Scaffold this active site. Structure first.
Site, mmCIF file in Angstrom:
data_model
loop_
_atom_site.group_PDB
_atom_site.id
_atom_site.type_symbol
_atom_site.label_atom_id
_atom_site.label_comp_id
_atom_site.label_asym_id
_atom_site.label_seq_id
_atom_site.Cartn_x
_atom_site.Cartn_y
_atom_site.Cartn_z
ATOM 1 N N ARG A 7 39.894 44.666 46.778
ATOM 2 C CA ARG A 7 40.748 43.469 46.772
ATOM 3 C C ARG A 7 39.997 42.260 47.341
ATOM 4 O O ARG A 7 39.691 41.304 46.621
ATOM 5 C CB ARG A 7 42.003 43.709 47.623
ATOM 6 C CG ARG A 7 43.292 44.061 46.870
ATOM 7 C CD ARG A 7 44.429 44.482 47.850
ATOM 8 N NE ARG A 7 44.541 43.605 49.021
ATOM 9 C CZ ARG A 7 44.606 44.022 50.288
ATOM 10 N NH1 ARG A 7 44.578 45.320 50.585
ATOM 11 N NH2 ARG A 7 44.697 43.133 51.269
ATOM 12 N N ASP A 60 57.858 36.485 38.737
ATOM 13 C CA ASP A 60 58.528 37.582 39.422
ATOM 14 C C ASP A 60 60.010 37.566 39.103
ATOM 15 O O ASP A 60 60.627 38.602 38.879
ATOM 16 C CB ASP A 60 58.324 37.483 40.927
ATOM 17 C CG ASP A 60 56.895 37.720 41.326
ATOM 18 O OD1 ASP A 60 56.220 38.524 40.651
ATOM 19 O OD2 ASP A 60 56.449 37.103 42.308
ATOM 20 N N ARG A 113 60.929 38.845 35.666
ATOM 21 C CA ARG A 113 61.031 40.287 35.717
ATOM 22 C C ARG A 113 62.376 40.695 36.322
ATOM 23 O O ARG A 113 63.085 41.542 35.780
ATOM 24 C CB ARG A 113 59.846 40.871 36.483
ATOM 25 C CG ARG A 113 58.517 40.326 35.971
ATOM 26 C CD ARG A 113 57.382 41.309 36.132
ATOM 27 N NE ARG A 113 56.344 40.787 37.008
ATOM 28 C CZ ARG A 113 55.110 40.511 36.611
ATOM 29 N NH1 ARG A 113 54.762 40.720 35.351
ATOM 30 N NH2 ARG A 113 54.221 40.040 37.483
ATOM 31 N N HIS A 116 53.778 36.138 46.236
ATOM 32 C CA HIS A 116 53.640 36.743 44.920
ATOM 33 C C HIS A 116 52.791 37.980 45.122
ATOM 34 O O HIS A 116 51.568 37.953 44.954
ATOM 35 C CB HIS A 116 52.946 35.802 43.942
ATOM 36 C CG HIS A 116 52.786 36.377 42.569
ATOM 37 N ND1 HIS A 116 53.848 36.799 41.807
ATOM 38 C CD2 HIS A 116 51.671 36.601 41.818
ATOM 39 C CE1 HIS A 116 53.406 37.267 40.646
ATOM 40 N NE2 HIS A 116 52.088 37.157 40.637
HETATM 41 N N1 LIG Z 1 49.907 34.180 39.234
HETATM 42 C C1 LIG Z 1 50.329 35.072 38.184
HETATM 43 O O1 LIG Z 1 51.500 35.367 38.046
HETATM 44 C C2 LIG Z 1 49.328 35.759 37.326
HETATM 45 C C3 LIG Z 1 47.966 35.577 37.567
HETATM 46 N N2 LIG Z 1 47.053 36.174 36.803
HETATM 47 C C4 LIG Z 1 45.588 35.939 37.151
HETATM 48 O O2 LIG Z 1 44.880 34.832 36.484
HETATM 49 C C5 LIG Z 1 43.569 35.194 36.338
HETATM 50 C C6 LIG Z 1 43.258 35.255 34.858
HETATM 51 O O3 LIG Z 1 43.667 36.391 34.150
HETATM 52 P P1 LIG Z 1 43.094 36.647 32.707
HETATM 53 O O4 LIG Z 1 43.624 35.586 31.767
HETATM 54 O O5 LIG Z 1 43.587 37.991 32.219
HETATM 55 O O6 LIG Z 1 41.510 36.545 32.815
HETATM 56 P P2 LIG Z 1 40.404 36.601 31.670
HETATM 57 O O7 LIG Z 1 41.530 37.120 30.710
HETATM 58 O O8 LIG Z 1 39.660 37.644 32.554
HETATM 59 O O9 LIG Z 1 40.311 35.079 32.060
HETATM 60 C C7 LIG Z 1 39.348 34.602 32.940
HETATM 61 C C8 LIG Z 1 38.514 33.445 32.435
HETATM 62 O O10 LIG Z 1 38.008 32.620 33.464
HETATM 63 C C9 LIG Z 1 36.724 32.235 33.125
HETATM 64 N N3 LIG Z 1 35.894 31.879 34.272
HETATM 65 C C10 LIG Z 1 35.329 32.724 35.154
HETATM 66 N N4 LIG Z 1 34.661 31.997 36.072
HETATM 67 C C11 LIG Z 1 34.822 30.692 35.791
HETATM 68 C C12 LIG Z 1 34.382 29.477 36.364
HETATM 69 N N5 LIG Z 1 33.574 29.478 37.554
HETATM 70 N N6 LIG Z 1 34.713 28.309 35.801
HETATM 71 C C13 LIG Z 1 35.470 28.300 34.693
HETATM 72 N N7 LIG Z 1 35.907 29.425 34.109
HETATM 73 C C14 LIG Z 1 35.600 30.616 34.631
HETATM 74 C C15 LIG Z 1 36.176 33.395 32.351
HETATM 75 O O11 LIG Z 1 35.177 33.018 31.483
HETATM 76 C C16 LIG Z 1 37.344 33.939 31.659
HETATM 77 O O12 LIG Z 1 37.445 33.553 30.334
HETATM 78 C C17 LIG Z 1 43.406 36.511 37.062
HETATM 79 O O13 LIG Z 1 43.074 36.308 38.376
HETATM 80 C C18 LIG Z 1 44.737 37.130 36.959
HETATM 81 O O14 LIG Z 1 45.052 38.051 37.929
HETATM 82 C C19 LIG Z 1 47.370 36.976 35.779
HETATM 83 C C20 LIG Z 1 48.728 37.195 35.493
HETATM 84 C C21 LIG Z 1 49.723 36.586 36.272
#
Ligand SMILES: NC(=O)C1=CN([C@@H]2O[C@H](COP(=O)(O)OP(=O)(O)OC[C@H]3O[C@@H](n4cnc5c(N)ncnc54)[C@H](O)[C@@H]3O)[C@@H](O)[C@H]2O)C=CC1
Ligand SMILES: NC(=O)C1=CN([C@@H]2O[C@H](COP(=O)(O)OP(=O)(O)OC[C@H]3O[C@@H](n4cnc5c(N)ncnc54)[C@H](O)[C@@H]3O)[C@@H](O)[C@H]2O)C=CC1
Ligand code: NA
Ligand code: NA
Lengths: 294, 294
Positions: A87, A147, A150, A172
């Site tokens: 984590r 949340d 859901r 969250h």
């Molecule tokens: N707050 C919420 O309720 C939720 C948050 N999340 C989070 O959001 C994040 C994204 O999830 P995914 O879309 O599935 O990720 P991906 O589907 O793994 O999207 C990540 C993107 O960020 C880009 N990236 C990485 N480093 C970067 C940088 N320094 N500058 C610019 N772009 C960069 C990557 O190239 C990648 O395309 C995760 O941390 C995930 O846990 C996901 C679901 C819900």
């Protein structure tokens, strides 16, 4: 109306799609270190756009310049993690990327509201507000909304009907809790069962589907809608508290008012037990931040 | 209104999402050999749903029973391919899966319209209609719509404005062509440049983004909308021809009328050169089918 998106990953791109489907947007911008990925998302969104007779400017790349003009920017950039790997390890890594983004967002699109989504959201939301000169009303995070979405489901499942209001607030994550004092809906339900399902639904889905996407996109959309359309709606939002509820120097999820000016703590009285649950969450989040040098 | 989805992959699931976002749907079903994947998609769509105050029944699994009741079923199941590995190889493999699905769709949801999306769409559309007892009006394919969406974009790019109509017909693939005779829009454009971009946009995106998703979902939605809402709209659709334009025993993309009864060849006169281009495409498709034992 220009929308900016830092991170064109699964959530960034599906968020932007959702917005395109339901908002009168003139320009959409997608920044991502994966340059080609960002371009391809842009291309695909445009083809999508043409099929509902919308024809906005959709540009994609890696230069933060693309953000100039954005009324609001959804930041989903970073890493999600698993394969054992820790984590706290990602917390450090992402915290590095978030600090780094805030600087870029400021020397490009100074006046943009910033929506933090990257996990651990409450933590990244705080780090964002800290690293950008910005007022606590122009930086906040999406989480509790999702949340709550859901929640609203598990309720309709358990019989509930005419669900007028139903929110989850606090962290969250694990220390989240239902704000029973504000629930409004016909039909008796088992608060035991419901409170429980919700917290572990997040990963129940991740292990099956691979990740959470459609839930997050809609939540993000509902927030962006409220701002770009000045709806004045009240949505559980992760926000920097400076006194409210006896909590300070931390971001945590509290009912907020979204509008053209961003977010503002909606002043709503909560159960006495509800305040403790919130204060607990602040403590946990405060721990996790000090762990990071904040 | 129940929507059925065979294939909960990237396009199946995003299609279903799109529909959920814009249609008054009571039930959505997602079948896929990847059982858990289908369940997780279902869960995630439901969370999404709750955020626009829709609360339909969303079930996911691997038993074709889930389809019972569907007014229409979007079939995206199969494989896309690349890493060198041959075109024809997938054609055989998918043709095996498509034949196999039609049988299941018939002994479960006999009266459902079937929308074929799996590539090579024109070919799978034909194989679907052949392997299910069904009339040529209850089985058809999405492709030309998507091609046209791309077209409408490259046009607005090239200056065109007030694009009232603009379609691509013929094979969903290399032998496709613009139906210039029906283009309707203000502003001079270069038909050379435009016709060209479109055919190779498909993979220009695939190499960057990884696959085509948002374009396809919307196209699929526009078709499903027209049927579930009996709009009577005219949309380039892949359809089994039994005489029209001097073509028979093959599926190919022609302007069609969608409504509660499915699809019917919209009788629209085309350029003399336009008929040849269509007849050519039929020949190519007819070759590719005989290659498969159809
Ligand atoms: N707050 C919420 O309720 C939720 C948050 N999340 C989070 O959001 C994040 C994204 O999830 P995914 O879309 O599935 O990720 P991906 O589907 O793994 O999207 C990540 C993107 O960020 C880009 N990236 C990485 N480093 C970067 C940088 N320094 N500058 C610019 N772009 C960069 C990557 O190239 C990648 O395309 C995760 O941390 C995930 O846990 C996901 C679901 C819900
Ligand atoms: N006609 C069109 O315009 C477009 C067609 N497509 C095509 O649709 C197909 C799907 O694309 P993706 O969504 O990206 O695929 P994925 O994203 O690879 O989706 C495929 C899904 O089908 C499932 N599946 C495989 N065999 C099955 C079986 N025997 N029964 C039930 N489910 C089975 C898999 O588990 C998988 O989840 C591809 O052939 C792709 O080329 C894609 C874009 C546009
Ligand atoms: Na406001
Ligand atoms: Na009809």
């Amino acid at each position: 109306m220009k929308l900016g998106f830092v991170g064109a990953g699964r959530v960034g791109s599906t968020s932007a799609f959702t917005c395109l489907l339901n908002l009168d947007v003139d320009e959409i911008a997608l920044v991502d270190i994966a340059e080609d990925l960002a371009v391809g998302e842009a291309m695909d969104l445009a083809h999508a756009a043409a099929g509902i007779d919308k024809y906005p400017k959709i540009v994609g790349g890696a230069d933060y310049s693309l953000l100039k003009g954005s009324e609001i920017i959804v930041v989903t950039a970073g890493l999600a993690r698993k394969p054992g790997m820790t984590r706290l390890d990602l917390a450090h890594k992402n915290a590095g990327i978030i600090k780094d983004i805030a600087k870029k967002i400021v020397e490009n699109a100074p006046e943009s509201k910033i929506l933090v989504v990257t996990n651990p959201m409450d933590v990244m939301t705080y780090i964002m507000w800290k690293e950008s000169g910005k007022p606590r009303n122009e930086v906040f995070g999406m989480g509790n909304q999702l949340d709550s979405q859901r929640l609203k489901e598990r309720l309709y499942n358990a019989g509930a009907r005419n669900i007028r209001r139903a929110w989850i607030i606090g962290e969250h994550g694990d220390s989240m809790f239902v704000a029973k004092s504000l629930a409004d809906f016909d039909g008796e339900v088992d608060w035991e069962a419901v409170e429980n399902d919700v917290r572990f639904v997040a990963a129940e889905v991740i292990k099956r589907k691979g990740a959470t996407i459609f839930g997050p996109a809609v939540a993000i959309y509902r927030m962006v809608k409220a701002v770009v359309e000045d709806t004045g709606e009240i949505i559980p939002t992760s926000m920097i508290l400076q006194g409210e509820y006896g909590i300070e120097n931390v971001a945590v999820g509290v009912p907020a008012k979204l509008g053209k000016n961003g977010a503002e703590v909606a002043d709503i009285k909560l159960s006495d037990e509800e305040i403790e649950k919130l204060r607990n969450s602040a403590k946990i989040l405060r721990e996790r931040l000090e762990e990071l040098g904040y």
